[model samples]
Target: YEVHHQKLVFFAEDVGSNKGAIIGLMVGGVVIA
Candidate 1:
């Protein structure tokens, strides 16, 4: 028996400031075989 797995996670965010409210983005992925 054999198994494999891969995964990744990313996150980004910005707080309000003189430039007004900022934006945020997040990405995630996973693969298994």
Candidate 2:
């Protein structure tokens, strides 16, 4: 599989807690067909 197209998204852990943080993404799914 190859990544020619992608989407930008944000993620977080422990969402509302004091230890919560935001995460970034790049490769997540396979679009090979």
Candidate 3:
């Protein structure tokens, strides 16, 4: 298995949530593969 962080170039802010979302996609602050 291989993985990397989604490139969040600009500044961002959130609730610090998604405890189980991208386990999947792009722009998700997640691995694209």
- Local accuracy of candidate 2 as per-residue lDDT tens digits, 1-33: 466666776655445554542346535654442
Between prediction 1 and prediction 3, the one with superior TM-score is 1
Alpha-carbon TM-score of each model against the true structure: 0.21, 0.24, 0.15
Model 2: colliding residue pairs: none
The candidate 2 region of ten consecutive residues with least summed lDDT is 17-26
Worst-scoring 10-residue span by lDDT in model 3: 21-30
Task: Report the C-alpha displacement of residue 29, candidate 1, in angstroms.
Answer: 20
**Which candidate do you rate higher for TM-score, 2 or 3?**
2
Clashes of each: 0, 0, 0
For this target, which candidate reaches the highest lDDT against the unseen true structure?
Answer: 2
Weakest lDDT window of 10 consecutive positions for candidate 1:
19-28
User: Per-residue lDDT tens digits of candidate 3, residues 1-33?
Assistant: 556766545443565766544332443354442
Clashes of 3: 0
C-alpha RMSD values across all candidates: 11.9, 9.1, 8.4
Model 3 spans with C-alpha error above 4 angstroms:
1-11, 21-33
